[PDB]
Amino acid sequence: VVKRTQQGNYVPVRPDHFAGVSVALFFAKAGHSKCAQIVPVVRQFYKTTNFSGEKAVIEIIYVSLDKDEQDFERVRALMPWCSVEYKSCLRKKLIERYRVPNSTAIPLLIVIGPNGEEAGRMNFQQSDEFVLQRWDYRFNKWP
Amino acid sequence: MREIVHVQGGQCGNQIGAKFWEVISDEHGIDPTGTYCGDSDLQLERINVFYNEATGGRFVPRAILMDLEPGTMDSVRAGPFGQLFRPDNFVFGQTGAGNNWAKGHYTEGAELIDSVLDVVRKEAEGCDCLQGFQITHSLGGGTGSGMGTLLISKVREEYPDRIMETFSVFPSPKVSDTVVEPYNATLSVHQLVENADEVQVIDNEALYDICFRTLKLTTPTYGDLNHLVSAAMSGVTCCLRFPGQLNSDLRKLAVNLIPFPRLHFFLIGFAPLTSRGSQQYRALSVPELTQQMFDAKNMMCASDPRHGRYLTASAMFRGRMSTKEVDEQMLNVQNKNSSYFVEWIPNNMKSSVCDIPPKGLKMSVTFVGNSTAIQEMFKRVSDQFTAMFRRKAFLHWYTGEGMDEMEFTEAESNMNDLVSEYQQYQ
Amino acid sequence: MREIVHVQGGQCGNQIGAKFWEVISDEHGIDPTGTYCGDSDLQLERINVFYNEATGGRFVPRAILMDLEPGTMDSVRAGPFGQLFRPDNFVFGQTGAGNNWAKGHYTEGAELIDSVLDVVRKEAEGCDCLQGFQITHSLGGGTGSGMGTLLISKVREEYPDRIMETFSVFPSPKVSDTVVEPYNATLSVHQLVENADEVQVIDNEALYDICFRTLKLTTPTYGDLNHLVSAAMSGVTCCLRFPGQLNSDLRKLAVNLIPFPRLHFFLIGFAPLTSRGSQQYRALSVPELTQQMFDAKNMMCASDPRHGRYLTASAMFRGRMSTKEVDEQMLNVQNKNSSYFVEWIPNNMKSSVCDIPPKGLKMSVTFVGNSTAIQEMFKRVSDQFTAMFRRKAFLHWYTGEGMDEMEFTEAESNMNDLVSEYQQYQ
Amino acid sequence: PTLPFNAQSCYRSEYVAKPLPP
Amino acid sequence: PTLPFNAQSCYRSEYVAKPLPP
Amino acid sequence: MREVISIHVGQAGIQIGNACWELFCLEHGIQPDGQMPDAFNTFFSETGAGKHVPRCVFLDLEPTVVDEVRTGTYRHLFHPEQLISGKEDAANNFARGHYTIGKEIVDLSLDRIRKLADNCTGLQGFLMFNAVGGGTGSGLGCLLLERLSVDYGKKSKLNFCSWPSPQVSTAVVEPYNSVLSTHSLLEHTDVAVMLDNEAIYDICRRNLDIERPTYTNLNRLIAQVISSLTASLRFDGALNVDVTEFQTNLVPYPRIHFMLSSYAPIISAEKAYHEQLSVAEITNSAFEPASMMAKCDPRHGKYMACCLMYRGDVVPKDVNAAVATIKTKRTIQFVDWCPTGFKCGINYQPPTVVPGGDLAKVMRAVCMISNSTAIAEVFSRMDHKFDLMYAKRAFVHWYVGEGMEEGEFSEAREDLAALEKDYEEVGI
Amino acid sequence: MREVISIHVGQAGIQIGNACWELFCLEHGIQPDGQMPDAFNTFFSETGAGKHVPRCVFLDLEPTVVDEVRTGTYRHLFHPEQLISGKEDAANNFARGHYTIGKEIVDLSLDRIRKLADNCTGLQGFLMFNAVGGGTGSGLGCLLLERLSVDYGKKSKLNFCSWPSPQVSTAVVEPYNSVLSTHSLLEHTDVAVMLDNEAIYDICRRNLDIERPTYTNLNRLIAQVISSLTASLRFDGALNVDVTEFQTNLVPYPRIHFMLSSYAPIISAEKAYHEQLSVAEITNSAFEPASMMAKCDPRHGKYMACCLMYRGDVVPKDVNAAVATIKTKRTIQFVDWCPTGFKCGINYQPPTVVPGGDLAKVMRAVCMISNSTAIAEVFSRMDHKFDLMYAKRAFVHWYVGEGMEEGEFSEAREDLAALEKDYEEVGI
């Protein structure tokens, strides 16, 4: 239901992976202007904060609101973090449960506590760009 | 941060400025619809130097398209990358300054300045504090040479602590359009030395020499020549947008270059300029870049620099250069070309490193030289002006628009003084 | 809590009033039938300010339609969102006032107030706590200026506590309708000053000028002018209907913008106003709102604002937004435009955050400004009044209906003091 | 041909359920 | 496609968070 | 135990006070419903099935803000009677809120106050939050201050007024309402703390780097201040100071009780944890004018008294060290006649945070309530505003119309003149 | 208690500074964060519990060099209040950085220095890092250090200036900035260590075996010398020195305080395996004229005072054996009037090597600072360059247009004339 992209093919991800870190769900499009804007800065931030140190510290599960297999695969193939399966029910469960209207509501970062609920809400559709440094993982990390 | 306000004037200006935004949009990777693609943070970490955010993610250029003839920039709108420019930034005219410097400045221009000064200050005052201006125009024409020079004079008295630098073409020696060249040139120069900080001269048949001897192209149009000028304009202001070893600013090369306030007219170079055929012989490295800096056929203006001595010059290298072979050879060319430079300045010739090479090449260098070779070129216009002033050729078109017999004699004397100041310094 | 009673008098009042209830119903998500759709609490939690429940679930407006010709009442009924008004709230005139303020007020309107004052008494008294009234009418016309002003006079002496604000259109500057404008406008103004709390002035030439340069609409009908003016109407009373960070009712504004009793004429503006083409090439943020909102090319009343001084003004912002940049921009516009404002009054501006944006936009502002620059319009109306009056022109219709000779002299004496009062404080 | 109402009061956006100090 | 950016700044690329001496 | 009653009048009073009740409910671990899953007794009562109800009354004439609280999430947290609403707004008219529409609501207000004060004896005093520039804030604020002064004449009454700002106004008739309220709170209240709207906008801009703030950011900062004043009442501390000893250490003369506020640190989420809020520098980040919460430069004033309330990991050695370096630092000036110008209060409980709000956790904080002679400029500025209005009776006809006698403008003017002279005299 | 405040002003100061601070952190075993998982007291404050912040200020007018530090991996290390940027660059102008733009930036900078210095007494001194030929490196350097000389009069100042090279200059204003700087730094500083650029290019060429040295590899070698200077302060040893006891041993006459530096070994990892670095040989390479870091050639020089700070596993029995062989060596020539010219010091810590650096793991290292009369040639050449440019008043219009009075060049000339004659008079 959640997929880790690795060297050669795609592997279901280890249950030990999400333990001990902060997990953010990244609500996004494919081909959208702000989506293409926000992908690389989040990639840079992810790279610097995980490779600065020994253990992985954050993990972003990317969730799509695309209507195409090709679009989903295309936007998914070029990312270092994991994603959610397109056909899995949990993606639509997350959409209905968080109330993205499916626009000004994309992209979105909702950082999640152990309880699978909203530990923090953050929107990119604004002038400021220091929100990436603003999200801190030392305050909401799981069991 | 720092803002550069772009203003294009005249027919020449709008056509050049069209290809300048071609290359600048290409340096940073903005799609012509305005969206960004190129996925690199160092590309557009300094994006606000030329463009503005629009809460759709689109970047609109801080350009003010400016003329009196409503067709020539109508062309720019329908062209490629014309949909970038803001519709409010257009300031149309109706009548058209028919190659008369007089009506560009005093009579016909004065009712349109009420609009163009409004739009320039609304974009100026919006930011923190401004850095410079860009004016692309011609000093042979009517609507660029005269009516553009008004916009030079008004914004200077409103922002005296800011800088501005222009790219202006002049009359060519053999070919010459626009039979009132020296009236338009000389009237423009004596206003330009009084209200402008820095001018880059371009000659038309010098550009033609480039595309024959170097580029090995038989029959391309203005598109190719504007591409060479657009690269030169991108090369000078590269360092504002990207970091480097030895940094540069427009004002820092301003203080470095001009010795005295009166003389600020600059030559232009660029490399590499070999053809498709000759590409595989060359293995691009630091010493052969410097050798085709000091090649007279590679000079953007066709005043032969071997006759004069270079007063000072700058070289904004771009790419990943090793700085020892940069500066040692930079000194080497000063020792090798001993007579080509002036004696009373030690270290005539300068350098910078601009850490991002232009895409499609790996090492590039832009030459800006304050030479005294412009002695003969302004002397050309001086004699051309005296030929049609001895008994008032073509004078009635100017005189009818509020000109004076006295103000023509001042323009001759004032521009002749600029000739004298260069000749004194040898 | 609070309910606002709407009164629609005249030709202009019905048309701008029909389009007004179109956007309020839009805002609150009311079906043209009268039902509700949009399943949210915030729209419906404060609806009794403009509407009334009917034990069918349908909401009826608290509006009283009033005219002396059944034609324009028919058109309002026959349009969409026409079934919404109560049939009983229509009141009918069987004769018709032809532009004559005399018959609108002294002879023909006098016997029809008796009918309509009953309607407004029944609706106002039935509520818990009345706040006040709004009246939309014309001043050029006979019924709007005549009977609309009489009804203003009657309910002020009946309900002397409650607020009153009028959306009145004035005689236009360049061209005109209702050739007796000064015999209608001036005869309303000296009575409007005596029994009204706020007057919001609209000019048609202003609305044509707005719709031309800004919205780029080729063919502006009264469909879009009434749509635009209604957008300003909803912005005034948004804080009454929706929760916000800083609430501001009518009484909030009245004590806020009125230094002296007799000077209570306003100058209305709305922002933003951009074409569909240039919709996404601007950055819709609070720096850009304030630059557009303070402009001579944005006011709904074509008196030049930089020919005067702003005595007091108010900016009622709307949308999901935030209270320091809106706060700093008020300080910023006041510091820079020191000569544009009055000196002896500091801190002229007002801020009122209204958290729900107008529908289909994201962030907006309405601007209500008490300016001394509107003294140009009272002179120009009075300038026209003197010329006709000294020649006893068109007077036999007014004095034939039962108006005194003395009344006209009293009216001219009143507004001459109004001009002199405004003039003294420049 | 309307759109949803998607404006939220300043009160409701920050006066919410709160996680208690321990 | 429009042609790519290959540079990385020296300060990012060489002042990495070093493992500490004991 | 010994409790305190909080009174909210006007729109500003409602909105600022509700941030206060969000913070108080959070730190005592009580839910929005009002029941926890004797330290909290200073702000919450007991009620039946283990549920706690605040000791606050909500007053406004227009319903548009107090009705919104009733439909908010804290619908069960407050007593239904404690939130009192009228039908018509005061509309920036001190005359209207004091004479016409004030008398019908003041009686219902002081009924609930009488019942809530008679629950237990030996209660501390009153906190009042109001807008000076506002109608009901100044109007109804005076009416309660008048009538509580005659009945509960014994006790302390602290005022936290949102004083109008120098350039930024949020009205234009606000010079009238300012000088009219000032005559009515000179001889009826005990301690007044002056707040500025655009000063906290400066704070949110440079210290906290919020380029784009809102009223929710304003009232969070105020709530942290109020909690710091009343921290000693609730939690155990090294050296406590109550609301009774505030006026002892800060009010030298009965007229002179207008005193500024400051908080430190005002630091961001990411900004804070990477630099120590050292006890030395947490006070050095309090005495500069830019950190002061009034837009009133004390550099051309003289500090008459000062009260510091530390909260958290604070030791008495560092407090005495921090005071000594400040007194020997030259840029501030103390008045000659007040050598013992410091009063230190230390509380053990760390500052609580509103999570995902504006601020962060810091291990220690300090709140300043300082009385100075810098207040002479803000009343002279208000006076210079007022004389130009009163030069030709602008906006007087609205005031005199309801029933207020003309000439109360004259006598309130000379009182502010009398107040201005006293401040100039004491600063010699 | 026992610390030194470091100041970086100008670009050359800044990016040397971020090179030296990464070395200082790495030797002390503190992370980029600034906490280990009383040796660190000389270069760091202690923040809260277990952290550190550097005792440094970052001062530059163009933001482009100091903001990049704010966005690097050394974000959280520096306190964010003294990472100071201006808005526009000083632009190669002495009068700009001294008069017009420099005024608004020193007031804030002095405040942070004074706040960092009032923590404890027994402050050791200052470590200035600046360029000379630059604009802000020279102008802003004077105005900041001039204010410090007024306030903290009787402390040491270490001006680690980067001198313009003999051949390569890369400005017209290299003579116009250098002559004016030293006029306004001669009577303000205590010890000014002479550093060159292309004297380190050829070091990397012949010893380190790098064909293509950039500005970073320049700054690592600078960072190694400064660590060896303050090694005595930081740690223990057989025989320690101190930054207060430099100018006692090195400044005979109050003006004669321009001195060189050297380091040994600088050996690449390829050739290091072929040498066992003994005390007898590393002291020989140190005095060898091609291994010093200014190439102000000492064969015509006449040595006056040398201070040899031996570092690492060196015993006292062979260091004196090493220095004995030097005195009898013919080429290294001491002045007649100064009989003893050697003061030597030992520390126990070996040099620290950065991972992925250029220098190899050595066991012993020698750092030299030497006062010599060779400095006549570096001042004579700089005097000659100025005279030719001032022959017909080139570029004076920029200086006099900025605000600096014409003729200030003449008093700066006669000062340098006096300085160049004092070395030649002493060395007779």
How many whole angstroms separate alpha carbon G214 and alpha carbon G208? 13
Length of chain A equals 143
Angle (CA) G27 G32 G36, round 5°: 60
Output DSSP code: residue G163: P
User: For an interface test with C, which of B47, B88, B92, B118 has the most C Cβ atoms less than 10 Å from its Cβ?
Assistant: B88
* DSSP, res B124: H
Q: Nearest residue on chain C to B83, judged by CA atoms?
A: C281
Is residue G248 a known part of a binding site?
Answer: no
Give the dihedral sign, CA C210/C214/C218/C222.
negative
**Cα separation, B98 vs B103, whole angstroms:** 8
Amino acid identity of G314?
V
F vs E contact (3+ beta-carbon pairs below 8 A): no
User: Exposed, middle or buried by CB within 10 Å (0-12, 13-18, 19+), for E12?
Assistant: middle
Which of B37, B41, B56 shows the shortest C-beta gap to A44?
B41
In three-state form (DSSP H/G/I as H, E/B as E, the rest C), the secondary structure along chain A is: CEEEECCCCEEECCCCCCCCCEEEEEEECCCCHHHHHHHHHHHHHHHHHHHCCCCCCEEEEEEECCCCHHHHHHHHCCCCCCEECCCCHHHHHHHHHHCCCCCCCCCEEEEECCCCCEEEEEECCCCCCCHHHHCCCCCCCCC
| Annotated binding-site residue? G284 | no
Query: What residue of F is the nearest CA neighbor of C241?
Result: F64
Type and span of the H or E element at G311: strand G303-312
**CA pair distance G376, G421, nearest whole angstrom:** 8
> What is the rounded distance in angstroms from the CA atom of residue B73 to the CA atom of residue C409?
59
User: Sheet harboring B363-371: ordered strands across?
Assistant: B63-66, B4-9, B132-138, B165-170, B198-203, B265-271, B363-371, B310-319, B352-354
A60-84 residues labelled b (16+ CB within 10 A) or e (exposed): bbbbbbbeeeeebeebbeebebbbb
Judged by CB atoms closer than 8 Å, whether chains meet at C320 and D8 is answered as yes
CA distance G123 to G151: 13
Q: Is F284 within 8 Å of G115 when comparing Cβ atoms?
A: yes
Q: Are E6 and B320 in contact (CB under 8 A)?
A: no
Q: Is B202 helix (H, G, I), strand (E, B) or coil?
A: strand
CA distance F181 to C158: 33
Whole-angstrom distance, CA of residue G428 vs CA of residue G248:
23
Record the tokens describing residue C176, joined without a space: 């005109």
C-beta separation of G59 from G9 below 8 A: yes
Helix (H, G, I), strand (E, B) or coil at C409: helix
- F interface test, pick of A127, A137, A139 with most F CB neighbours within 10 Å: A139
CA G51, CA G54: separation in Å to the nearest integer?
A: 10
In sequence order, the β-bridge partners of residue B154 are: none
| CA–CA distances in Å: residue F92 to residues C127, F61, F395 | 24, 12, 11
Q: Write out chain B residues lying below 8 Å of C277, CB-based.
A: 87
Catalytic annotation present for F187: no
Distances from the Cα of A23 to the Cα of A14, A72, A113, B340, angstroms: 14, 21, 8, 67
Query: Which of F275, F277, F325 lies closest to G53 in CB terms?
Result: F275
The DSSP code sequence of C169-191 is EPPPSSS-SSS-SHHHHHHHHHH
G170 annotated to a ligand binding site: yes
Q: How crowded is residue G247: how many other Cβ atoms within 10 Å of its Cβ?
A: 16
Tell which residue, C180, C225, C175, C181, has the closest CA to residue C202.
C225
CB–CB of B256 and G92 under 8 A?
yes
| Under 8 Å between Cβ of A47 and A84 | no
Nearest to D11 among F27, F68, F355 (CB): F68
Per DSSP, the residues of C135-146 read EEEESSSHHHHH
Residue B283 CB-half CA count within 13 A:
0
Whole-number CA gyration radius for chain A: 14
Nearest chain D residue to C23 by CA distance is D2
Contact C84, C25 (CB under 8 A): yes
Provide the CA C241 distance to its chain's centre, in angstroms: 18
Chain D, 1 to 22: residues with Cβ < 8 Å from chain C are: 2-5, 7-11
Query: What distances in angstroms separate CA G129 from CA A140, F136, G10, G171, G198, one per listed residue?
Result: 42, 61, 8, 20, 18
Do the Cβ atoms of A138 and F270 come within 8 Å?
Answer: no
Which chains would you list as touching B if contact means 3+ CB atom pairs under 8 Å?
Answer: A, C, E, G
**Min Cα–Cα distance to chain F from C237, Å:** 13
Q: Name all chains with 3 or more CB-CB pairs below 8 Å to chain C.
A: B, D, F
Give the C-alpha separation, C295 to C398, whole Å: 41
Distance CA B81, CA B20 (A): 11
Chain F residues close to D8, C-beta within 8 Å: none
Nearest by CB to C128, from F87, F135, F167: name it. F87
The answer to whether the CB atoms of E15 and G355 lie below 8 A apart is: no
Q: Is the minimum CB–CB distance between G73 and chain A shorter than 8 Å?
A: yes
3-state secondary structure of G321: helix
Chain CA centroid to CA G202, Å: 19
Method: cryo-EM
Chain breaks in chain F (C to N over 2.5 A) after: 37
Task: Please list every residue in chain B whose beta carbon sits closer than 8 Å to the beta carbon of residue G170.
Answer: 246, 327, 347, 350-351
Q: Which of F245, F402, F408, F420 is catalytic?
A: F245
Interface of G with B (CB under 8 A): 62, 64, 68, 87, 89, 91-93, 167-172, 174, 198, 201, 211-215, 385, 388-389, 391-392, 394-395, 397-398
- Give the span between the Cα atoms of B407 and B338, in whole angstroms: 43
User: What is the DSSP-derived secondary structure letter of residue G334?
Assistant: B
Is G64 flagged in the annotation as binding? no
